[PDB]
């Protein structure tokens, strides 16, 4: 969906989101222009007539109560229905058809809040003829758009006089209630409805949180589901996996569910429940807590559509790469360097600590360069982390050139942004390792950089060590005009200068030695 050139190449999750949202907004603008000026695109130049390409017609026809009623279910709104009820009740006083009244009630309950109150209190004027369909759709509406006492009253009225109707009724009853839940389940199973288990899914959704006294009975309820043999175990299974949430991991149940989802993966899947999108995200959320790599590989035909939203995809990939990092890591970095362009701070931090524990120093540069190429700019948390981890090292002598290069790039990025004020406190935190790496070939750069640092300070023990190594690595005056100044500045450089002045520094001139004596 994204373009190929590098400039248009979306190099971050938020900007990519905004980009394809702008594309969708252009699609909506196209819809608006076509449905505002249909006559322009009315020409059917293409030989195969396609209603997908034909302009769209939400235009009410002339006043015609019967055809207007038939067009009600075509226009998909509520003002037309109000006007039609008005025309049929006030002056006509007749019903075009009970099916038409049922469809009107369907639409009005779907559309639903004082407006919902008015829409629900304006349906009782409907002609006496109100069958089950009408009553149970009123229940549907009062449940999924308003409070639950009204739905309960309507259900009692119906009893005095469907699968997802009773589903909504159970939702209303539930949303501690032990006897309620029990009698509900009992009479529901007693009736001959034979639900599609969406009632069970909804009662699970309501049981999202409870102790073992309903977490464990869910297992036998699922075993009964399996015995009747209806459920694919797509959503209720995942919801009980989530309900397992937790002061202590349950390794036994974890292994059991591992085998279960293993055979579920082995078999082929077909979608039936609209809530299979939270499946992916919360499943990987539980996987992250579990921390297992064979588990991650198991969780990894066209079942990749259930990821959907970029937020859930982000959570999944983040937890996946985090587990893979915190698991050698050669195969992990292989998988990563394979999926980085397709895939999208915390992940990079985990990568840095994984590379540290691995000791693969040569890899971190390329990773930092990739992050910078994509979106890593105007933030120094990861810069601090990489600098500390890379200059805790000095063991590669030839790699000091790469140290200097990446340090120069890091400083080029660090000094970009004055107006923001955020670049002022970055050197105070991470300039020490940067300057040490610069010292480790080129030295004048690090010299003047430490000058700028101290002339911005927060001295440090490794800063003292840096100053000492720099001074000892031939030029007395060039070393003095730095070490003596930093000593006059602060006391630890002075207690180090006490020793520095022995070799060849104090013999040059006494005015700076006099200043040192005064400060000491």
């Amino acid at each position: 969906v994204f373009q190929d050139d590098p400039y248009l190449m979306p190099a971050s999750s938020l900007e990519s989101r905004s980009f394809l949202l702008a594309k969708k907004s252009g699609e909506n603008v196209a819809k608006f222009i076509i449905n505002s000026y249909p006559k322009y695109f009315q020409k059917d130049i293409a030989e195969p007539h396609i209603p997908c390409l034909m302009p769209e017609y939400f235009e009410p026809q002339i006043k015609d109560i019967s055809e207007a009623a038939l067009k009600e279910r075509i226009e998909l709104r509520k003002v037309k229905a109000s006007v039609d009820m008005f025309d049929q009740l006030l002056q006509a006083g007749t019903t075009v058809s009970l099916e038409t009244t049922n469809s009107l009630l369907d639409l009005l309950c779907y559309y639903g809040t004082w407006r919902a109150k008015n829409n629900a209190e304006r349906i009782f004027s409907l002609m006496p003829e109100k069958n089950e369909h009408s009553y149970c759709t009123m229940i549907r509406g009062m449940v999924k758009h308003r409070a639950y006492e009204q739905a309960l009253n309507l259900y009692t009225e119906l009893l005095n006089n469907d699968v997802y109707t009773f589903n909504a009724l159970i939702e209303a009853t539930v949303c501690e209630k032990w006897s309620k839940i029990l009698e509900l389940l009992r009479h529901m199973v007693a009736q001959k409805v034979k639900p599609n288990l969406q009632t069970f899914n909804t009662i699970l959704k309501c049981l999202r949180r409870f102790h073992v006294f309903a977490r464990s009975p869910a297992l036998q309820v699922l075993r009964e589901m399996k015995a009747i043999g209806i459920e694919p175990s797509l959503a209720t299974y995942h919801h009980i996996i989530r309900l397992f949430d937790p002061g202590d991991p349950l390794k036994r149940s974890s292994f059991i569910i591992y085998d279960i989802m293993n055979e579920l993966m082995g078999k082929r899947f077909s979608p039936k429940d609209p809530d299979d999108d939270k499946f992916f995200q919360s499943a990987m959320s539980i996987c992250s807590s579990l921390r297992d790599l064979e588990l991650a590989y198991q969780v990894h035909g066209d079942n990749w559509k259930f990821i959907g939203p970029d937020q859930h995809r982000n959570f999944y990939y983040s937890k996946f790469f985090d587990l893979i990092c915190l698991m050698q890591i050669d195969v992990t970095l292989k998988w990563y360097e394979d999926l980085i362009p397709s895939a999208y701070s915390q992940t990079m931090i985990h990568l840095l600590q994984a590379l540290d524990v691995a000791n693969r120093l040569e890899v971190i540069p390329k990773i930092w360069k990739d992050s910078k190429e994509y979106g890593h700019t105007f933030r120094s948390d990861l810069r601090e982390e990489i600098l500390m981890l890379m200059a805790r090292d000095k063991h590669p002598p030839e790699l000091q050139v790469a140290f200097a290069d990446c340090a120069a790039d890091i400083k080029s990025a660090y000094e970009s942004q004055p107006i923001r004020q955020t670049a002022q406190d970055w050197p105070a935190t991470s300039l020490n390792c940067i300057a040490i790496l610069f010292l480790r070939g080129r030295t004048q750069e690090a010299w003047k950089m430490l000058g700028l640092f101290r002339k911005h300070k927060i001295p440090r023990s490794e800063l003292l060590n840096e100053l000492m190594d720099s001074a000892k690595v031939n030029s007395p005056s060039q070393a003095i005009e730095v070490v003596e100044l930093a000593s006059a500045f602060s006391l630890p450089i002075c207690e180090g200068l006490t020793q520095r002045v022995m070799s060849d520094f104090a013999i040059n001139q006494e005015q700076k030695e006099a200043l040192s004596n005064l400060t000491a």
């Binding site: 905004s18 949202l21 702008a22 907004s25 252009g26 909506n28 603008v29 608006f32």
Partner: protein, 128 residues
């Protein structure tokens, strides 16, 4: 017609008439010269008569972390935009056409007492 319309540069050439008879021989004309102008650079691509608010090009796409929606600029706001764009164009044209004050040297219409500033730097580098 729209098919009859065409790009700008050839219209500008045909209107300015830099060459073809007038320029040659040095005859020129009697102090009439059409000034060059660029209309595309001036106005942003978004605005028009119908003031639809474009989150893609005209309005920032995201506000308060919420996707925006296509909306209508009322006619009063449309008139405000038209007025301030008229003002902006008038200001641009004012800044375009102005006086030129080369300091009077020996006399008007004479290149005697005017200085062109110091010489240019040399290739090897020699500031004069």
């Amino acid at each position: 017609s729209f098919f009859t319309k065409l790009t700008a540069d050839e219209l500008w050439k045909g209107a300015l008439a830099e060459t073809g008879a007038g320029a040659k021989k040095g005859r020129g004309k009697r102090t009439k010269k059409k000034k060059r102008k660029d209309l595309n650079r001036g106005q942003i691509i978004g605005e028009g008569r119908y003031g639809f608010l474009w989150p893609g090009l005209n309005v920032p796409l995201m506000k308060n972390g919420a996707v925006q929606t296509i909306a209508q600029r009322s006619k009063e706001e449309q008139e405000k935009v038209e007025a301030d764009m008229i003002q902006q164009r008038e200001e641009w044209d004012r800044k375009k056409k102005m006086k030129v004050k080369r300091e009077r040297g020996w006399s008007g219409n004479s290149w005697g007492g005017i200085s062109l500033g110091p010489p240019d730097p040399g290739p090897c580098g020699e500031t004069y």
